[PDB]
Design a protein around this nucleic acid. Structure first.
Ligand SMILES: [K+]
Ligand SMILES: [Mg+2]
Ligand SMILES: [Mg+2]
Ligand SMILES: [Mg+2]
Ligand SMILES: [Mg+2]
Ligand SMILES: [Mg+2]
Ligand SMILES: [Mg+2]
Ligand SMILES: [Mg+2]
Ligand SMILES: [Mg+2]
Ligand SMILES: [Mg+2]
Ligand SMILES: [Mg+2]
Ligand SMILES: [Mg+2]
Ligand SMILES: [Mg+2]
Ligand SMILES: [Mg+2]
Ligand SMILES: [Mg+2]
Ligand SMILES: [Mg+2]
Ligand SMILES: [Mg+2]
Ligand SMILES: [Mg+2]
Ligand SMILES: [Mg+2]
Ligand SMILES: [Mg+2]
Ligand SMILES: [Mg+2]
Ligand SMILES: [Mg+2]
Ligand SMILES: [Mg+2]
Ligand SMILES: [Mg+2]
Ligand SMILES: [Mg+2]
Ligand SMILES: [Mg+2]
Ligand SMILES: [Mg+2]
Ligand SMILES: [Mg+2]
Ligand SMILES: [Mg+2]
Ligand SMILES: [Mg+2]
Ligand SMILES: [Mg+2]
Ligand SMILES: [Mg+2]
Ligand SMILES: [Mg+2]
Ligand SMILES: [Mg+2]
Ligand SMILES: [Mg+2]
Ligand SMILES: [Mg+2]
Ligand SMILES: [Mg+2]
Ligand SMILES: [Mg+2]
Ligand SMILES: [Mg+2]
Ligand SMILES: [Mg+2]
Ligand SMILES: [Mg+2]
Ligand SMILES: [Mg+2]
Ligand SMILES: [Mg+2]
Ligand SMILES: [Mg+2]
Ligand SMILES: [Mg+2]
Ligand SMILES: [Mg+2]
Ligand SMILES: [Mg+2]
Ligand SMILES: [Mg+2]
Ligand SMILES: [Mg+2]
Ligand SMILES: [Mg+2]
Ligand SMILES: [Mg+2]
Ligand SMILES: [Mg+2]
Ligand SMILES: [Mg+2]
Ligand SMILES: [Mg+2]
Ligand SMILES: [Mg+2]
Ligand SMILES: [Mg+2]
Ligand SMILES: [Mg+2]
Ligand SMILES: [Mg+2]
Ligand SMILES: [Mg+2]
Ligand SMILES: [Mg+2]
Ligand SMILES: [Mg+2]
Ligand SMILES: [Mg+2]
Ligand SMILES: [Mg+2]
Lengths: 117, 206, 65, 146
RNA sequence: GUAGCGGCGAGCGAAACGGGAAGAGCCCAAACCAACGUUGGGGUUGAGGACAGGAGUUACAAAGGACGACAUUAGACGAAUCAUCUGGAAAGAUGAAUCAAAGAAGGUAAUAAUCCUGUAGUCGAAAAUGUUGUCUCUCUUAUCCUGAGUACGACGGAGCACGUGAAAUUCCGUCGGAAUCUGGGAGGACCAUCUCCUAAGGCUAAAUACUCUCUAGUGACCGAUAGUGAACAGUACCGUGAGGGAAAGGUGAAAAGCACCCCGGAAGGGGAGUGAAAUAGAACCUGAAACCGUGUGCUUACAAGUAGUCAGAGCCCGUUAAUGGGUGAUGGCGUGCCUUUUGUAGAAUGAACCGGCGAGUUACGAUUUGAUGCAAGGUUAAGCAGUAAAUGUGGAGCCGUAGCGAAAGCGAGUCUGAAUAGGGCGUUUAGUAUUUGGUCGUAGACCCGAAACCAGGUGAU
RNA sequence: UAACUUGGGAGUCAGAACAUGGGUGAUAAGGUCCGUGUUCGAAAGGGAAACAGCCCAGACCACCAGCUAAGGUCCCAAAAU
RNA sequence: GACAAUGGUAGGAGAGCGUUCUAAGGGCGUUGAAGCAUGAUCGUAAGGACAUGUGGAGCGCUUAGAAGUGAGAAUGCCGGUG
């Protein structure tokens, strides 16, 4: 028998268009450019889920550097001291402690300095 | 082996011995499936056609010159990508019937009959006593034999009064022993077969 | 319609029991002064169609049993 | 088995491959044909046995022999196939045909010597191999040429 | 797809036997008689002829009537249901019944065996048309000859599966040109024997081919870009002409198709009515997208960009309640897609956008794999019966059980060979039928596209 | 931890750079033709500003965890003024 | 439970999604089917539900069978509209 084109085409295309909500102009309206932009969005999001981890480690390191220089220390020497002292607190936690509790961070700096001298 | 023979009033009129080579085999489901598929395919008429680019009316001339107009090159207004053009491939009239070895056909018939035997779907009656066609009488007879809705009635030869009386009842089908086929037996929930028809079936199918 | 046997091929090979094709040898028509004695003697002996050639020509002789 | 519960035997059915229906199938676009050339074309490809213009194999090889118009081919029965008859049987082409030993009689029946004959028989056949006659007579039987 | 034909290339490709459908045989010319060369009689072949009631207008000769039959071309009858509920409407649901040789189908305000038209079944023809049976009606009771410009032959061609070849067999043109039952022809050059037949006159039903039609039906065929080109057309339109050739279906159950009032010249509207519904009001079922507008929650006039993505305050909301939705200051990262390419952001190709349509199919063969039945066996084809079925029957045929050899042949071997030699191919079981999948072959063979070639026409407005 | 044999199904027959052994050219070419290896092709990720073919390294998916490679640590811009 | 593997073009292999039609079974529907529209829903993907509006009469599910079975590109064809 004959299979007419039917409704499946419209359903698939409408899915893509709904995924393109908020895009500029024709990119939220026309199926072809919307499909291209949604593909681009998937590829970008895959790349950026990996890049996000780099970005946030970088932010924590910058903050830890600022906090350590407030105690006459560089980031690299502070991390060397913490490693030699056996302290396993990661960079997110160290930056959060430096922001939240200055005194606890000062004690951590004392431990790192002691392990180096 | 031993099957009860009933009267149309529902009483035990005797007993019959039906061979285990026809009603007592283990059903072969692969062969039975193939037989059912074969019979359903043989029922297909296969009358379906479309017009390819040669069969569509007109379309002799080249629509425009090959080069220079800026249009896509075209050869006939009846090409498949044209609206109203010829169909590429599509249905063409053909038969769907095919054949299987005779031994497989016999094994399929035996398997269907044996499946009826195992599932308590075999009812043997002494004889049908219908001098004049009357659908109401056959309906009451099926009521008295505690039969389900889908019933296949098997007589030895062409019984005109039985066929006339059971013809209009939905879910009831009538055939002869020679006319037994896998679709008819498989569709039925129960088999109502006379003693003589059972003997003839046992003889023909061994 | 039925496939057609390659009649030229059919005139040059025979099927063996295992399904291989026995063939005659090229270079056996003339110019025998230019081939050595041993060459001609050994060119009298039949060969088989090679497997690489069989892969190419099997359908041409599907009916020649 | 019910018509609403049909089941093909395992491994007896397989879905056909449809090419040119999208990239994910692996046969979309070029549809398994690769790219360009003669073999990529509709109706494309050289005839079987064509070697691109190199002289083909069945032209570089010579023709050989002839066909005998009067070629006689015999139906053959070996000794091991005569072992199905009872001792003292008189074997005849009619009996061999009736017993299923010989389907097509052809130019005549010939008895060959493969297998062991452990039953005394009387055999009437058009031809006998030497070992067939020796083994039929050795087992106490007799043979005749008809 | 054998034998054979074939730049022995591409390809082309029988027939007899066997199995079936159907079945039917006959009339002359001639010798020879009767009559006045022409008419009658007679005769019709593989050896015959000369001489010595049963058959019929379907061939075998040809015209008619009587009565009956059937069928076709109009028609007739034809079983059985009520109630409530939701509804605009009941056939739906619910409850209780009925008919059935009728539970095919269509219609009826939604989906009906029992409301209607019908169906099963039965009945029916004034007239005409057929097919037909009986009666009738017709007709019948080796002395001589046996197809002559023939057969046949040469040359040139053609048809035969066959390309002139070892080419028989059939036909045509030109030219030549027999024999006369002790005859003549064929059996694949040709000769002899043998075998079969009897040319050069004619007639013949059936089995077979097709479908513009008609009647009755059918479909795992289309459902308005499909299916006819055409559901409303060979029309509109184009062309001097031959010729080419569209688009265009749907109110509602019922027209109940909007009385009347208001703005307006009208068109068109807002009310009022009809209707279940009028955003069902005729451009009339549903009414997607592109595209065009009106309102506004967040945002935007120091900013450099494939427009997103990840991070992220602020503001506005509140969901299939989910570690929610909308927007988004600001920061990081980031040169569309497809094709074709060594390599394309490419300034190489293609796409204005949206929608619809648009490309490995089927038949018959081959091979392989999986499945299944049977197994030294496996299996039928046409045909017949059957419901366009399954299936039953049909064993002709096909493959296998044995190979080797160019062949004669021999045979678990065989070929080569002088060989008790060596070597090649074989033996020291498993096939076969159907079918799913893959692939190949013949077909247009995945789709679209030339420039051209040929044939028959139409044009000197 | 493969290899070979037998079958079913292919695609491929335009290659490119780099390093190195050579011909050719002019110890020219992002030249051309052979040998050898790698990568690209058909490979994203980090480095070389950008940059198929160079260096590091082969992405099953998720994480706001950790250690390293090439390459780097004054600011752009992570880490030694 | 504990080890390994899972970049990929031509291409080979496997498993699935969805469309129309058919058979059988079992269901839905004027207390509103298909279609359409919206949504913050589910599944590893193709895709599947539910709720609400529109619509006004047909349509799912299960198993099996068959295909005119899936479009974004062909200076593709037709229509509509920029
Ligand atoms: K260009
Ligand atoms: Mg349809
Ligand atoms: Mg479409
Ligand atoms: Mg045409
Ligand atoms: Mg020679
Ligand atoms: Mg691929
Ligand atoms: Mg594509
Ligand atoms: Mg190729
Ligand atoms: Mg291409
Ligand atoms: Mg190429
Ligand atoms: Mg073509
Ligand atoms: Mg009536
Ligand atoms: Mg009635
Ligand atoms: Mg009622
Ligand atoms: Mg004659
Ligand atoms: Mg000829
Ligand atoms: Mg001839
Ligand atoms: Mg000839
Ligand atoms: Mg002759
Ligand atoms: Mg429509
Ligand atoms: Mg049309
Ligand atoms: Mg059409
Ligand atoms: Mg009005
Ligand atoms: Mg008004
Ligand atoms: Mg009004
Ligand atoms: Mg109105
Ligand atoms: Mg509306
Ligand atoms: Mg409308
Ligand atoms: Mg400024
Ligand atoms: Mg500003
Ligand atoms: Mg700018
Ligand atoms: Mg950037
Ligand atoms: Mg490439
Ligand atoms: Mg280039
Ligand atoms: Mg671009
Ligand atoms: Mg540009
Ligand atoms: Mg180009
Ligand atoms: Mg363009
Ligand atoms: Mg488009
Ligand atoms: Mg193909
Ligand atoms: Mg191939
Ligand atoms: Mg160089
Ligand atoms: Mg170079
Ligand atoms: Mg190199
Ligand atoms: Mg690699
Ligand atoms: Mg890379
Ligand atoms: Mg990189
Ligand atoms: Mg880089
Ligand atoms: Mg630089
Ligand atoms: Mg970079
Ligand atoms: Mg550089
Ligand atoms: Mg470190
Ligand atoms: Mg930096
Ligand atoms: Mg820094
Ligand atoms: Mg992979
Ligand atoms: Mg990996
Ligand atoms: Mg594949
Ligand atoms: Mg699949
Ligand atoms: Mg599916
Ligand atoms: Mg539908
Ligand atoms: Mg399609
Ligand atoms: Mg397009
Ligand atoms: Mg426009």
């Amino acid at each position: 028998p004959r299979v007419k084109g039917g409704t499946v085409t419209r359903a698939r295309r409408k899915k893509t268009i709904k995924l393109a909500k908020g895009y500029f102009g024709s990119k939220h309206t026309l199926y072809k450019v919307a499909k291209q932009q949604v593909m681009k969005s998937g590829q970008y999001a895959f790349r950026d889920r990996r890049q996000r981890k780099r970005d946030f480690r970088k932010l924590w390191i910058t903050r830890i550097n600022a906090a350590a220089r407030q105690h006459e220390m560089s980031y690299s020497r502070l991390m060397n001291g913490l490693k030699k002292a056996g302290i396993d607190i990661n960079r997110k936690m160290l930056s959060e402690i430096a922001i939240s509790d200055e005194k606890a961070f000062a004690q951590l700096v004392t431990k790192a300095k002691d392990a180096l001298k | 082996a031993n099957y009860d023979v009933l009267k149309l009033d529902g009483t035990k009129s005797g007993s019959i011995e039906l061979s285990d080579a026809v009603f007592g085999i283990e059903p072969n489901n692969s062969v039975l499936f193939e037989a059912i598929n074969l019979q359903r395919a043989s029922l297909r008429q296969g009358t379906h056609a479309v017009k390819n680019r040669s069969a569509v009316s007109g379309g002799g001339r080249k629509p425009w010159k090959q080069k220079g107009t800026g249009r896509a090159r075209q050869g006939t207004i009846r090409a498949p990508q044209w609206r109203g053009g010829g169909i590429v491939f599509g249905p063409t009239p053909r038969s769907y019937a095919y054949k299987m070895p005779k031994k497989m056909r016999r094994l399929a018939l035996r398997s269907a009959l044996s499946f009826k035997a195992q599932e308590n779907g075999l009812t043997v009656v002494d004889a049908f006593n219908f001098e004049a066609p009357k659908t109401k009488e056959f309906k009451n007879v099926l009521s008295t034999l505690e039969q389900p809705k889908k019933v296949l009635v098997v007589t030895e030869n062409e019984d005109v009064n039985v066929e006339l009386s059971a013809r209009n009842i939905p879910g009831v089908q009538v055939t002869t022993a020679q006319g037994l086929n896998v679709l008819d037996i498989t569709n039925a929930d129960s088999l109502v077969i006379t003693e003589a028809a059972a003997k003839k079936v046992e003889e023909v199918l061994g | 319609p039925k496939m057609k046997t390659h009649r030229g091929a059919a005139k040059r090979v025979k099927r063996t029991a295992s399904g291989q094709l026995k063939r005659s040898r090229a270079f056996t028509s003339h110019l025998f002064a230019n081939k050595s004695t041993k060459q001609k003697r050994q060119l009298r002996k039949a060969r088989l169609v090679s497997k690489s050639d069989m892969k190419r020509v099997k359908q041409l002789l599907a009916y020649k049993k | 088995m019910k018509l609403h519960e049909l089941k093909p035997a395992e491994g007896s059915r397989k879905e056909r491959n449809r090419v040119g229906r999208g990239v994910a199938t692996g046969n979309g676009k070029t549809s398994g044909r690769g790219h360009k050339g003669q073999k990529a074309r509709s109706g494309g490809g050289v005839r079987p046995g064509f070697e691109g213009g190199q002289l083909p194999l069945f032209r570089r090889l010579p023709k050989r022999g002839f066909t005998n118009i009067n070629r006689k081919e015999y139906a053959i029965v070996n000794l091991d196939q005569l072992n199905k008859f009872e001792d003292g049987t008189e074997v005849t082409p009619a009996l061999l045909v009736e017993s299923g030993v010989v389907k097509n009689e052809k130019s005549g029946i010939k008895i060959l010597g493969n297998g062991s004959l452990d039953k005394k028989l009387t055999v009437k056949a058009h031809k006998f191999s030497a070992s067939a006659a020796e083994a039929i007579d050795a087992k106490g039987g007799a043979h005749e040429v008809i």
